[PDB]
Design a protein around this ligand. Structure first.
Ligand code: HEM
Length: 154
């Protein structure tokens, strides 16, 4: 699909707020993912021992991983759709090593939208949320096509 420049600017204006504190946003998004869809935590051999939200919040390693994840996504979003180079390594690791189905990328997209809706109503009204959804749908479309090329059904 293709986003307009106006849609990308709605995406990037909320991402600017995420970047005030990427670590805290990443904690909220990964915890939301794990609480809403507990099966996703089982894909993380390093983190699946965490039993409760308190343990997740206290995990320095989970915090650092959330920064890694949201910084990678932010670099993709800043490409405004021209993200082929960024998707190659991410698709290869997520298809082949981590084995993350497209359904689970849908779940993390839902968690991202949920947390931005909660934290950022000033920059995440209905039009801005639709633009973010379109950007995440494009990310998932393009990663699913790369999954197929790499041999993984997703
Ligand atoms: C917005 C979507 C996502 C982004 C941008 C993203 C990004 C990343 C990055 C940058 C890494 C480290 C380098 C690499 O291994 O590729 C990583 C690792 C990983 N990702 Fe993701 N990821 C996403 C979604 C998911 C989802 C939904 C799952 C699981 C349900 C997942 C599971 C993993 C695992 C298991 C690792 C390894 C963690 C470790 O170091 O122990 N990823 N991800």
């Amino acid at each position: 699909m293709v986003l307009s420049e106006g849609e990308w600017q709605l995406v990037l204006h909320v991402w600017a707020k995420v970047e005030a504190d990427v670590a805290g946003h990443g904690q909220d998004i990964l915890i939301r993912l794990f609480k809403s869809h507990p099966e996703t935590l089982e894909k993380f051999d390093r983190f699946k021992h965490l039993k409760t939200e308190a343990e997740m919040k206290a995990s320095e390693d989970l915090k650092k991983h959330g920064v890694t994840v949201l910084t990678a996504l932010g670099a993709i979003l800043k490409k405004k759709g021209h993200h082929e180079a960024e998707l190659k390594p991410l698709a290869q690791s997520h298809a082949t090593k981590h084995k993350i189905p497209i359904k689970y990328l849908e779940f993390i997209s839902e968690a991202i939208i949920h947390v931005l809706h909660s934290r950022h109503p000033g920059n995440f009204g209905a039009d801005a949320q639709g633009a973010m959804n379109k950007a995440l749908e494009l990310f998932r479309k393009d990663i699913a096509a790369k999954y197929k090329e790499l041999g993984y059904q997703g």
